[PDB]
Design a binder for these strands. Structure first.
Lengths: 251, 345, 217, 121, 216, 107, 121
RNA sequence: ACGGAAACGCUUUCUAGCUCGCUAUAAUUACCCA
């Protein structure tokens, strides 16, 4: 029962595909490399990626690639598998296209029995908000949880989320309530909430079982480290990582 | 059940005065006969203001006229012939011997400290007063609770640690709290016909005399048996309450060899039960761990009335001799000597 | 079926109590530890939480075999009366306490009472340097009485469990005549007398003629 | 007179106005008045301040009427208390008590006097 | 014919009522359980949904046959009164519980009321180690009266179950006079009482005068 | 000018099962109390319109009599309603037809 | 003076500027100021701030007058709280309130002081 | 002769469950001033 009962939809897109076909190759050199053979080879390479090889990246997962190819991909599915499938698709498209040709997903979380026109349009609005975030972005779930693929995959989905899972699934005192109040303080966020969180974490540090306290101490110093980092890029990661964790542990 | 109850019956050899904080002044009582009348002075003012006489009462209060006979508000009513005495408050009869001064000057008492009372108009003895008197016995007779319980010079160094007794929640630890497990309840409230208003009498060494003090606290008449309960909840506390009848004697033996000696035997009383020293008059050697507070208490008094050397004065009073509960002439009591007996119920 | 009965006890005070409250604008030289009182009548209340969570500990040292260490660990002779919040079928109460409002606000004025509370002065004699530390704790006076209503629920989950529970309600309501009822406790402040334990039904139909004999025992 | 938004300041510069020992440079600017008599002034008004929370003005104005005579008597005992009731206008403010909400204000003025005494020496 | 039967009443409190609002993070010393409040006047408010839910589960303890698994698994007498989400004829049926809005907001102020919500300080004593976790939880004044009304609408489909439903509604008001109506009710909060029950037709025509006799 | 911070309140609410007795919380955003809204209602008079307008106005004003007794809004059986009408004037725009007999049917 | 961008930072670098305990090397570099002598000052302003939302300012200007009474009185009792109101300028944050949003700003300043006191030991 | 006509984002849902304002504490100490 470890999940919320939702289904996600990702509409990926290669950013600047038209800029990759009009100019494409004339950036390296003196206009001597945009030729016919390289253009046809790149075109067959991209169709070979986005039509054949999406089935390999989505082989075990519980999703359904509705439409795929050219640049655009529109895939419904169960939500953990959708998010991991976007992660695998980006982590194989930068292995494919050498870090060039950034792609931009936008994921939307939906309840059951919602129509797949009210779903597809909200995911498309998420996706164009991601494309307008920067050249590359993934817009998880909402028009404010916009990240980069360079930062969502490493920091949010594998660094922060595994640290939160490694901390929380070892202990048996702090439950869902501490995580909910943490997201509330991460979402409200004036400067005074940094002091309120400094009081809250220090109050809960000595409320624990005093044997395994330094588990909570190395968690709370780390959480206060990525609340008050003052870069605006390490706070929304913590909020979305706790959203994904509360989604994962919802009964 | 774990709650092993008790029954303490206490006995007044010397008069006992307990708290109440407030005190009447030189112009807050009436003395028409052997009764002192203590009225509710707001209602005294509310009756007396009808005559437009209160402006005269504004002159009488700042009037430092001599010959104290005409200073104590009896002469105000014997002068302006106010003749009711129908006011509120309580009226207690005299001790009869706290007026060392000449007959008919008598009644010139000055500042009387009230006894503690509950709101119906009766007095009682609080359970917290007996519990704080019990705690000094249990702290001075348990020899593990005298040695290291001192300042260690944290501030200017006078202060105690106050942690050497099981105290508090204390995270992780099981709830100890020995003195939570000693639950002294209040006394059954008696009536105002056992209060006599003794005067303080200081009897010093090195000038063998009994110079009185102008502090006339109300007190308890001697030979009054007072009910009490001590309903414990831990057998560790049951040990201390069972050994009260021996630790009180041990405390009195380490007291009388230490402070009551160098003061003569005629001023001392007998015991007749197990001895205890209830509040307000017994001195700072019944309120303290005295075997470590000999060099710390006298540091505080660097003022106009320093203690004479160490163990400076013995406090006596004057009550009617009821027996013979004394062993001497002129009725010098000890002001705080009491004697209890304990039994399980 | 579904009934609901009601205990109309009267808490008479004996050397009355002080259920604390915290005030940030009290005084300088007056009350710093006040009794909790009603805001519009200014009579002291014995609130229902300090009755319920006192009877919970009294019967939790008694009606448990495993040492509890927490609520949601009681042996379900309690937790079907007081409710857990981690057991599935025992989340709701089945006991509804009440605030005990002061009844005799006029049988107290019959006696010479000029304030329904009394302020006690209570120093702390430092056992070295003999010095004091006064305070003024407020407390409700001796001959008070408080209308104590307690309500017991009855559904068709009590197959044979109704008349068992009055060996839990009378056990709590004559173990509170042993304990202090919140307050300083070990300095007095507690002893009480649940007069007139007189159960009666207020919803549904139920026979309490067999019930009023194990209350006067 | 005193309203809610001045009684602290009125009580502040009163204690700056109180006389000190011109002689005796041992903790200098030590007042002629001590903390004990000021607490014995405040203990007259503390019970009234509690009864102005619980009770009404009507069962209380006789206690207020006696409190003026209490301050009169405490003035006539010591010269510094005779002056403190004149630097801080106490008897001027006791004439104007028309409400619960003025009696509580006067008791806060007394507590402000004690607080600013304790803050200064 | 079609009609609406408004039930004017007053909810006089006793043992003052706590109905929680936000679970938001209380400030560092502030009130930990704030009561729900009208955002204009900042007075207390009993919402209509507490009055619907508690009355719903009180009549469900009386007027069922089996123990229900959800508010849609109720009987025919409660689904027509409150509303069944599953049935084809019991959606939106027979009762609008309007709010309750502090009628005597100034009769309390004619007595000595500082503010309209007291803050009861409270704690809990741990069993092992006997510590204390305090809480400053808020509740309305002991003698407030809130403004209760129910637009019991007739539907021109029952026409003999009219008086049948008021033996249920007055029973629900008796049960609310016995149960607690929101908050920590096993710790003696809530305890409503219903002053001046009066049913009155506001639209159509019905014989409510032969029907206030049961209200009395 | 009455003094308020944001135009919508957030009523917290919950759901309690009758088996587990377990909560299930909601947050309902709500337009706050005593707001006013500019309501207006064109009623067009035409040729076929004539001779029945007298029972288009003991129905329109019998309809606005109903909205002050039913809820006008979602979740209206739990409060969330009680809409009142005020300044209910019936003017006329683009036409030659008096309304000053209708205006006392309403006000 | 304290405004909406700095009143948490003022509290942080006013707790940090406070002096630490010299002796007592069990939990060393700790504060003279016990937690109770600061919670019994936030106790005033928390019950103010919960009342500032309900009540108008010009019915809550006696409680703010009592604030400067109590801060001065708690300062004159022990040197630690005197050092606190001299380091974190609480008296000069109390002459300047005069309206509701500044009163809530001062209450949140006191809360930030308590929060950063609990944070650093 | 308005890609228009008709159409309530609506029904059901308790901010609820559990929790002692509690632990320690003598209104007391010193002896005088004119």
């Amino acid at each position: 029962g470890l999940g919320i009962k939702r289904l996600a939809v990702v509409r990926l897109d290669v950013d600047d595909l038209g800029a990759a076909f009009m100019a494409g190759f004339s950036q390296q050199g003196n206009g001597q490399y945009s030729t016919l053979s390289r253009s046809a080879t790149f075109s067959r390479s991209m169709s070979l990626f986005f039509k054949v090889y999406i089935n390999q990246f989505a082989s075990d997962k519980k999703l359904s690639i509705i439409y795929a190819g050219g640049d655009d991909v529109f895939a419904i599915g169960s939500w953990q598998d959708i998010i991991a499938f976007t992660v695998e698709l980006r982590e194989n498209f930068i292995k494919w296209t050498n870090g060039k040709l950034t792609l931009s997903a936008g994921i939307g979380l939906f309840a059951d029995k919602t129509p797949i026109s009210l779903m597809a349009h909200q995911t498309g609005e998420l996706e164009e908000a991601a494309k307008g975030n920067e050249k590359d972005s993934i817009s998880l779930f909402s028009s404010d949880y916009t990240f980069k693929f360079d930062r969502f995959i490493t920091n949010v989905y594998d660094d922060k989320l595994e640290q939160i899972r490694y901390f929380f699934n070892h202990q048996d005192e702090r439950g869902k309530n501490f995580i909910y109040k943490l997201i509330e303080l991460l979402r409200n966020h004036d400067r005074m909430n940094m002091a309120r969180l400094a009081y809250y974490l220090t109050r809960l540090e000595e409320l624990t079982r005093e044997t395994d306290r330094d588990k909570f101490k190395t968690f709370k110093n780390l959480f206060y480290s990525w609340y008050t980092n003052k870069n605006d890029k390490d706070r929304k990661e913590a909020e979305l990582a706790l959203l994904l964790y509360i989604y994962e542990i919802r009964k | 059940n774990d709650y092993r109850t008790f029954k303490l019956s206490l006995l007044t050899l010397a008069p006992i005065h307990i708290g109440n904080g407030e005190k009447y002044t030189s112009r807050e009582f009436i003395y028409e006969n052997k009764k002192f009348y203590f009225p509710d002075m707001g209602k005294f003012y509310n009756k007396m203001v009808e005559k437009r006489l209160a402006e005269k009462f504004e002159a009488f209060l700042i009037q430092t006229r001599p010959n104290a006979r005409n200073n104590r508000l009896i002469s105000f009513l014997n002068d302006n012939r106010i003749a009711e005495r129908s006011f509120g408050g309580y009226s207690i009869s005299e001790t009869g011997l706290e007026s060392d001064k000449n007959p008919n000057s008598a009644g010139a008492i000055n500042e009387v400290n009230k006894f503690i009372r509950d709101a119906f108009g009766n007095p009682y003895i609080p359970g917290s007063s007996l519990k704080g008197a019990i705690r000094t016995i249990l702290m001075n007779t348990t020899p593990k609770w005298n040695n290291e319980n001192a300042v260690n010079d944290f501030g200017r160094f006078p202060k105690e640690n106050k942690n050497l007794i099981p105290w508090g929640p204390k995270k992780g630890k099981e709830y100890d709290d020995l003195f939570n497990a000693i639950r002294v309840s209040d006394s059954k409230p008696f009536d105002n016909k056992s209060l006599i208003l003794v005067q303080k009498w200081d009897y010093s060494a090195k000038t063998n005399k009994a110079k009185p003090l102008p502090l006339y606290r109300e007190s308890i008449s001697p030979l009054t048996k007072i009910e009490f309960e001590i309903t414990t909840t831990t057998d560790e506390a049951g040990r201390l309450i069972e050994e009260l009848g021996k630790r009180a004697q041990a405390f009195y033996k380490d007291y009388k060899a230490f402070f009551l000696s160098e003061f003569p035997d005629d001023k001392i009383q007998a015991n007749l039960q197990y001895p205890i020293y209830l509040g307000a008059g017994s001195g700072a050697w019944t309120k303290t761990l005295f075997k470590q507070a000999d060099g710390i208490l006298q540091r505080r008094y660097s003022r106009m009335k320093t203690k004479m050397v160490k163990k400076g004065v013995l406090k006596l009073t004057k009550a009617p001799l009821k027996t013979s509960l004394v062993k001497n002439h002129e009725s010098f009591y000890e002001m705080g000597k009491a004697n209890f007996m304990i039994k399980e119920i | 079926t579904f009934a609901k009965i009601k205990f109309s006890a009267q808490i008479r005070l004996e050397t009355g109590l002080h259920i604390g409250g915290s005030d940030a604008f009290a005084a300088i030289g007056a009350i710093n530890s006040p009794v909790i009182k009603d805001p519009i009548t200014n009579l002291p209340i014995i609130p229902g939480s300090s009755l319920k969570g006192k009877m919970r500990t009294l019967l939790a040292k008694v009606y448990n075999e495993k040492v509890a260490e927490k609520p949601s660990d009681d042996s379900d002779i309690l937790s079907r009366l007081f409710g857990n919040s981690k057991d599935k079928r025992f989340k709701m109460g089945r006991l509804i306490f009440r605030d005990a409002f002061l009844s005799n606000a006029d049988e107290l004025d019959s006696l010479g009472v000029r304030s329904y509370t009394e302020v006690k002065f209570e120093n702390t004699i430092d056992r070295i340097t003999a010095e004091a530390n006064p305070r003024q704790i407020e407390r409700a006076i001796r001959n008070s009485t408080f209308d104590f209503e307690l309500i017991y629920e009855i559904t068709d989950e009590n197959e044979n469990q109704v008349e068992e529970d009055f060996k839990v309600i009378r056990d709590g309501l004559k173990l509170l005549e042993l304990d202090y009822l919140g307050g300083s406790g070990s300095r007095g402040y507690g002893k009480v007398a649940f007069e007139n334990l007189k159960a009666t039904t207020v919803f549904g139909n139920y026979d309490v003629k067999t019930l009023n004999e194990l209350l006067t025992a | 007179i005193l309203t809610d938004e001045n009684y602290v300041d009125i009580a502040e510069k009163a204690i700056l106005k109180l006389e000190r020992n011109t002689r005796n440079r041992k903790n200098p600017d030590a007042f002629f008045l001590t903390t004990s008599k000021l607490r014995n002034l405040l203990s007259l008004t503390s019970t009234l301040f509690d009864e102005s929370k619980v009770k009404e003005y009507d069962a209380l104005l006789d206690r207020i009427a006696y409190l003026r005579v209490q301050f009169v008597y405490q003035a006539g005992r010591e010269i510094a208390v005779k002056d403190l009731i004149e630097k801080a206008q106490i008897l001027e403010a006791l004439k104007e008590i028309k409400d619960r909400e003025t009696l509580q204000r006067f008791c806060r003025y007394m507590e402000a006097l004690v607080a600013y005494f304790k803050f200064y020496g």
